[PDB]
Write a protein that binds this ligand. Structure first.
Ligand code: 1RZ
Ligand code: 42E
Ligand code: CL
Ligand code: NA
Ligand code: NA
Ligand code: NA
Ligand code: NA
Ligand code: NA
Ligand code: NA
Length: 292
DNA sequence: GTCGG
DNA sequence: GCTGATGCGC
DNA sequence: CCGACGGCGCATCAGC
């Protein structure tokens, strides 16, 4: 948190590059600079000090210098105040609204959530769901709720066919105290690298018990949607949550599990998601999810 | 925007 | 209607 | 100096 001013500034610039400029490589450059500075154990005093870090070059060093002198960046102040650029950047916070859709909406005078609400006919299915749960989607999920969600998923999965194997992956599997979403990996002995309706049946059951509430996409191997825990008589509704379910062939299942458990950095220096009869087999060259 | 061949 | 391209999320 | 900078499932578009 020592350089939060700088990292905040670089993330804001990254967002403008991705959402407004449509310059994905600059978005990534700014994000990489932000992340190396975030983990730097000193409070940065000059652009020159920052440049020493991989991913910080001449232009970001110059911006760091301006920020340290003035607590702001003229360029960033100007883009913030720009009605068009700030509106485009904002609308991409809606799931399903990317840089192209945001630009098209803003060019039509649709600039706010309110405007989106009045214009349901101009939104596709995903965007309508993104708008409906805009606030809920930006919330994190407490571990306590993830456990309750896990409970429902594993119960209903076994109920459909006791031969399914399902594992909730992500930071949750590593024992984290909160998650952004629920990631479920599903397999079945019948499904292998060369092999009916295995995903649909699970999705249908989870809908039957009113756990899955909406669908963003559903193909033969991947479901993306929305779920919600049940409430009671006089306790406030749980937020709606993002849930993904991936059907993976049995012989590739445990590579997927390794992958989708992470962490990202752990995967990187353990280094694909596809190609084994357990997590231990791959470890070869064993660490449990807690210490990954 | 940064890096490196 | 078909097929390959594009947008999007992650 | 100048090209690399990620891959893939699904929804939907754009070109015939
Ligand atoms: N951007 C990323 C993030 C994760 N990973 C890999 C594959 S999924 C595995 C575990 O991801 P985590 O759940 O720790 O990261 P998330 O960003 O989903 O944290 P949550 O907000 O907890 O959900 O790490 C990646 O390759 N690229
Ligand atoms: P989500 O943020 O839940 O991430 C989980 C998995 O990580 C992989 N991933 C994340 C981000 C990006 N940009 N690319 C990517 O492959 C797949 S989903
Ligand atoms: Cl770019
Ligand atoms: Na551009
Ligand atoms: Na550097
Ligand atoms: Na979006
Ligand atoms: Na977004
Ligand atoms: Na996640
Ligand atoms: Na597909």
């Amino acid at each position: 948190t020592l350089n939060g001013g700088i990292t905040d500034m670089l993330t804001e610039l990254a967002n403008f590059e991705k959402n407004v400029s449509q310059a994905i490589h600059k978005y990534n450059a700014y994000r990489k600079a932000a992340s190396v500075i975030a983990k730097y154990p000193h409070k940065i005093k000059s652009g020159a000090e920052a440049k020493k870090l991989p991913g910080v070059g001449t232009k970001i060093a110059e911006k760091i210098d301006e920020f340290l002198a003035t607590g702001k960046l003229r360029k960033l102040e100007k883009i913030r105040q720009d009605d068009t650029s700030s509106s485009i950047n904002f609308l991409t916070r809606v799931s399903g609204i990317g840089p192209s859709a945001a630009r098209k909406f803003v060019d039509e005078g649709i600039k706010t959530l309110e405007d989106l609400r009045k214009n349901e006919d101009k939104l596709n299915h995903h965007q309508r769901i993104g708008l409906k749960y805009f606030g809920d989607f930006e919330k994190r999920i407490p571990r306590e709720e993830m456990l309750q969600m896990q409970d429902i998923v594993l119960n209903e999965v076994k109920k459909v066919d006791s031969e399914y194997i399902a594992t909730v992956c992500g930071s949750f599997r590593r024992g984290a105290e909160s998650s952004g979403d629920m990631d479920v990996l599903l397999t079945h002995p019948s499904f292998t690298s060369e092999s009916p309706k295995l995903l649909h049946q699970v999705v249908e059951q989870l809908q039957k018990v009113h756990f899955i509430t909406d669908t963003l996409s559903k193909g033969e191997t991947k479901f993306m949607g929305v779920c919600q825990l049940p409430s009671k008589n006089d306790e406030k509704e749980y937020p709606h949550r993002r849930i993904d379910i991936r059907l993976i062939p049995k012989d590739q299942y445990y590579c997927g599990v390794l992958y989708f458990t992470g962490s990202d950095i752990f995967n990187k220096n353990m280094r694909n998601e596809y190609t084994v009869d357990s997590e231990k087999d791959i470890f070869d060259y064993y660490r449990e999810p807690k210490d990954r």
